[PDB]
């Protein structure tokens, strides 16, 4: 990656606060380091005369440095937190405004865990980045540089003889990293697999508790995992300890002591000019490790910001493209299809040139082998994704040329995923029409076979819902069916799988549907094709395009694929 890359560089509006904070952190770190120079100056004084006044001066200087360091650190923390809070608020507003505009299909493509992960996890990770990683890394990179400059200013020979351990450490670590190529990716793959193993073992717990001999597989996989970990780590242990030895302050201490004793005994060192190394020379080994630590640490936040930005710069709906001026076919609910071709990926197309027209008051059905673009078509009809070629009009008026309000004003649908918005059960039934006069809600709930249950609820038509509401799948589906009945939109979409979702509470849902589809242009995604025998127009489709449409009796009297699906068990 690089700069000016607007797929990871969404954190551009705070580049100037970031550089000012970097400068402030560099100043804070130099103020942290200064006490050692003050100590060296104190020693230089003490070694020759230096009446009490001169030492008191150094004490006052040290107190001043402590004070200004603490003050600068506090200022830096406050400023960073302020700018981070402001940016996070702006980002939350931007993300919500974006989320209010993505096409519905995206949601039932990501899911629920991914949504939460993205929003809260990435927001927290980016906030942690801005508040901790950047200043800590700036400090970790600015401290060793300063120490090194100060050391070379004092005496350019002890620094050279001190480089040794750093050199051998670099040598051994390069050897190890080029000597572990396969094992690292192998262990990564092992981890990704063992995650699935753990998931499956935790899922199938009753099966393990009843059939106790079905645990063998996971235990063997875990044994192989730990054996691989051992056979990986155990060999490169001597190399690791021999390379971790040339970081110990003992080694740098011995080096410095030896070279200083050599230079002083030969009277070419001015021993008072050796104390800087003695003080800030042993931890130079750990300084570079800290460099690597921080520079690696500022990576999770970066990748999180990149993912959040590639989410933000999504492609919203083309909506309102130059109104089609509704044609003269018919404009009640006569929905007509066209040469429609659509694919989830820019490659393989799932749908190909359907072009089927529904009439007002007709019931059409879709029948294909499960996984043959059977639901994708009805899903497209409700503007979950834009088509790639061809048009789709509701009343001879292209759906893309329709406001998101005007569209769903007439294309109400009942798919899976009841999707209860937690609130007043009465208001949750009357979500469609904002304020029904408390009687429409009741009669709709009575005509959706849910009134008795919602009265059996603890309180009644005020009960705030939730995870612990107690409602079952059938109960929630009937609530949403009541809401759709109250909606009263004269074009409907039935996912027939909603009927036989709760196999016990199924007759009541069937009655609710029979009441819901009394006057519509229902488009049924029929799974069990016996429920579609009096439908006005059957449409079988397989692997995309339509093959043949008609009524049940005719299509059965003309043999292809439908006599096939019919004779299969049903005869």
């Amino acid at each position: 990656s690089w700069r000016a890359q607007a797929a990871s560089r969404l954190l551009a509006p705070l580049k100037l606060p970031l550089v000012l904070s970097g400068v402030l952190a560099a100043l804070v770190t130099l103020a942290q380091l200064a006490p050692f120079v003050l100590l060296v100056e104190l020693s230089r004084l003490l070694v020759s005369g230096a009446g009490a006044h001169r030492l008191f001066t150094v004490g006052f200087a040290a107190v001043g440095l402590l004070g200004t360091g603490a003050l600068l650190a506090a200022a830096l923390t406050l400023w960073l937190h302020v700018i981070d809070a402001r940016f996070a608020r702006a980002l939350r507003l931007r993300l919500l405004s974006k989320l209010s505009r993505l096409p519905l299909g995206w949601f039932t493509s990501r899911g629920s865990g991914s949504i939460k992960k993205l929003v809260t996890d990435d927001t927290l990770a980016l906030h942690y980045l801005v508040t901790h990683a950047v200043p800590d890394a700036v400090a970790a990179v600015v401290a060793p540089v300063g120490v090194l400059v100060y050391l070379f200013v004092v005496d350019w020979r002890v620094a050279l003889v001190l480089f040794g351990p750093v050199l051998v450490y670099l040598t051994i670590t390069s050897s190890l990293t080029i000597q572990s190529g396969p094992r690292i990716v192998q262990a990564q793959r092992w981890a990704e697999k063992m995650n699935g193993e753990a998931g499956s073992y935790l899922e199938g717990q009753p099966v393990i508790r009843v059939f106790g001999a079905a645990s063998s597989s996971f235990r063997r996989r875990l044994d192989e995992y730990i054996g691989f970990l051992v056979a990986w780590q155990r060999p490169l242990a001597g190399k690791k300890t021999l390379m971790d030895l040339a970081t110990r302050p003992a080694t740098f201490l011995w080096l410095i002591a030896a070279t200083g004793t050599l230079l002083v005994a030969t009277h070419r060192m001015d021993p008072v000019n050796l104390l800087p190394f003695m003080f800030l020379g042993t931890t130079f080994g750990a300084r570079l490790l800290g460099i690597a630590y921080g520079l690696g640490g500022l990576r999770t936040g970066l990748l999180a910001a990149r993912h959040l930005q590639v989410t933000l710069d999504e492609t919203e709906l083309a909506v309102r493209e130059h109104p089609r001026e509704p044609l003269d076919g018919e404009a009640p609910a006569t929905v007509v299809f066209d040469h429609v071709t659509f694919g989830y990926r820019p490659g393989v197309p799932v749908i190909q040139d359907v072009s089927l027209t529904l009439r007002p008051g007709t019931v059409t059905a879709l029948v294909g082998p499960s996984g043959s673009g059977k639901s994708t078509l009805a899903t497209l009809l409700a503007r979950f994704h834009d088509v790639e070629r061809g048009a789709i009009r509701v009343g001879g008026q292209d759906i893309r040329s329709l406001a998101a309000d005007e569209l769903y004003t007439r294309v109400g649908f009942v798919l899976q995923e009841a999707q209860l918005v937690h609130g007043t059960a009465a208001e949750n039934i009357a979500l469609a029409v904002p304020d029904a006069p408390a009687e429409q809600v009741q009669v709709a709930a009575r005509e959706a076979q849910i009134h008795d249950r919602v009265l059996r609820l603890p309180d009644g038509y005020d009960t705030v819902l939730g995870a612990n509401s107690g409602l079952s799948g059938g109960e929630r589906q009937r609530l949403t069916i009541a809401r759709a009945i109250l909606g009263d939109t004269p074009v409907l979409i039935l996912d027939e799988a909603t009927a036989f979702a709760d196999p016990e509470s199924e007759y009541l849902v069937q009655q609710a549907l029979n009441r819901l589809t009394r006057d519509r242009t229902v488009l049924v995604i029929a799974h069990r094709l016996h429920t579609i025998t009096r439908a006005d127009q059957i449409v079988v489709l397989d692997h995309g395009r339509i093959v043949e449409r008609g009524t049940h009796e005719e299509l059965l009297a003309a043999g292809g694929r439908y006599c096939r699906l019919w004779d299969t068990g049903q005869g």
Binding site: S100, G238, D244
Partner: protein, 576 residues
């Protein structure tokens, strides 16, 4: 409590490693005490008499090198040992954790603790234990060794150690508290967004997207109210220790200067002591540089802590003399509420079943109907009651033998990552392929094993694997028929648009030599018609414990269920 336990049987290795670490520490400490005379000589009129002390320091250095090399080797060994032991212990102690503990997040916790803690432990041994302990112990022994050289300055370090350690720990605690407050506030903030994004379809479909959006945005812009406590309690987490360290340095240097200005130790000694003071103060910063690693490891091992310190169900005490060829499952005055998400579901039910007689359970959905098939299998514990399989309790059983009485056909089937044959052979590993063939033929699944490539052996575990719904439910049925146990609990699985599954269930019900007591919660009339003692469970209590022929023509709610099933299988969407 029990978080990371070494084998705890071979005390020798542990005590040897401990004394070896202590020896490395005392060598690293005598390093600076040997620095003292060297630096004292390097300033006097005769700096040529420091070669002896340099040689002694070199001796101490090579001793420390050998010592800590051996210590690192022992550390890596013990790390492998502890990884192996604790991973086996964690994976061993999860058939016994009480089943209602696996909540929505307690499951993710255990998943992480199982599949994310290898490298964490193999580094936890050395990278955590040895530096943290050595750097803590080093200042104390430094002071102890500094007592003979200069008493008034030795006790100063011994007074300093507790204060600096307390300051360090207080800074760490402040940091942790500020961080948890921060991310808690962040979650409180960005939960409404998750809520508005979950229900984005119903809102959009009901033309209520802009008011909800404006409401959430108004709330966001309204609350604000940050800073003050957050910023105020986030500040100290580094200033505390930074101040404390610089202050200790100032105080020690001032003490040394005061004692070399009053004429108690000549100028060269004061310089050496000033150097030794920085040597003494270094390990505290070395420890303070280990705060984030320690916190990460603390969380990672808190995962294992939560896993191991989970509740356990025990029955034990030994029973099951012979085998009770055909038992009789009665359990009277029983109640069982789900600990966690409470509510007295299934309170006070009682029914004595019969040996070898199918007993179908039928009722409204979500009425505590699979909890009964759990309690019968002994997979759960009744709060106030007693399951009485064959006139004996089920909690008076050695766990190894209480799982050899039932065989369940669980609602949601689970096939672990292996092959179909291995799944079917999970019931009785020591079976013969003839019994396996009989089962795979009786479960209406031979056509499935012959309707796939390469035969029976097939990667089936996950990722579709060509297995879909009824296709794997029939494998589960074939597996539950192999385990010879004198009880067969069959909780129906939803298998719409598939009649082979229902036919296999009817076959398991009718044609079976075993002649075992069976319990089949089902709804479909075909499955329900082959029983002879039906229970109607409505809201955690049996209502119509009669029989088909007498429940139809006499009572209610069951003519209701019967007519609903009979006229719900002929509902076709008319073109009206």
């Amino acid at each position: 409590t029990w978080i990371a336990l070494v084998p705890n049987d071979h005390r020798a290795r542990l005590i040897g490693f401990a004394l070896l670490a202590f020896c490395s520490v005392v060598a690293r400490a005598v390093g600076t005490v040997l620095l003292v005379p060297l630096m004292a000589a390097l300033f006097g009129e005769a700096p040529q008499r420091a070669w002896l002390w340099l040689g002694w320091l070199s001796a101490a250095t090579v001793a420390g090198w050998v010592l800590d090399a051996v210590t690192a080797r022992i550390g890596i060994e013990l790390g492998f040992a502890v990884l192996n032991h604790t991973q086996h212990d964690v994976a061993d102690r999860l058939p016994v954790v009480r089943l209602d503990w696996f909540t929505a997040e307690n499951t993710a916790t255990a998943r992480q603790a199982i599949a994310a803690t290898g490298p964490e432990l193999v580094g936890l041994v050395v990278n955590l234990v040895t530096p943290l302990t050595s750097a803590i112990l080093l200042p104390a022994v430094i002071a102890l060794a500094l007592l003979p050289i200069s008493w008034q300055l030795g006790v100063a370090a011994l007074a300093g150690v507790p204060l600096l350690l307390g300051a360090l720990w207080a800074s760490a605690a402040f940091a942790r508290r500020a961080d948890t407050a921060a991310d808690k506030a962040n979650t409180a903030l960005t939960e409404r967004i998750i809520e508005f994004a979950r229900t984005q379809q119903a809102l959009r479909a009901a033309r209520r997207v802009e008011p909800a959006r404006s409401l959430v945005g108004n709330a966001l812009a309204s609350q604000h109210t940050a800073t003050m406590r957050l910023l105020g309690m986030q500040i100290p987490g580094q200033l505390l220790f930074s101040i404390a360290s610089q202050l200790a340095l100032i105080v020690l240097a001032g003490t040394t200067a005061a004692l070399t200005i009053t004429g108690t130790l000549t100028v060269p000694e004061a310089i050496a002591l000033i150097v030794v003071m920085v040597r003494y103060l270094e390990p505290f910063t070395a420890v303070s540089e280990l705060a984030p690693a320690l916190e990460s490891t603390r969380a990672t091992l808190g995962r294992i802590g939560s896993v191991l310190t989970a509740p356990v169900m025990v029955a034990g005490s030994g029973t099951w003399r012979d085998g009770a060829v055909v038992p009789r499952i009665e359990f009277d005055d029983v109640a069982f509420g789900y600990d966690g998400g409470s509510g007295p579901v299934l309170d006070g039910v009682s029914f004595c079943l019969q040996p070898g007689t199918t007993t179908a359970i039928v009722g409204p959905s979500g009425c505590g109907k699979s909890t009964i098939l759990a309690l019968i299998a002994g997979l759960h514990q009744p709060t106030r009651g007693r399951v009485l399989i064959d006139g004996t309790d089920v909690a008076t059983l050695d766990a190894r033998a209480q799982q050899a009485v039932c065989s369940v056909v669980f609602q949601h089937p689970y096939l672990f990552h292996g092959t179909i044959r291995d799944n079917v052979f999970a019931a009785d590993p020591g079976a013969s392929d003839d019994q396996f063939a009989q089962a795979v033929r009786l479960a209406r699944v031979d056509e499935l094993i012959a309707r796939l490539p390469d035969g029976a052996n097939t990667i089936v575990g996950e990722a579709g694997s060509a297995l879909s719904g009824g296709e794997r439910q029939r494998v589960s049925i074939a597996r539950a028929l192999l385990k010879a146990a004198p009880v067969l609990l069959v909780d129906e699985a939803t298998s719409a648009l598939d009649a082979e599954n229902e036919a296999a269930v009817v076959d398991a019900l009718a044609a079976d030599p075993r002649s075992r007591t069976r319990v089949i919660v089902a709804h479909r009339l075909a499955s329900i018609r082959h029983a002879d003692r039906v229970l109607f469970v409505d809201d955690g209590r049996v209502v119509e414990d009669g029989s088909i022929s007498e429940l139809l023509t006499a009572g209610g709610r069951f003519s209701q269920f019967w007519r609903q099933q009979h006229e719900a299988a002929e509902w076709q969407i008319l073109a009206e």
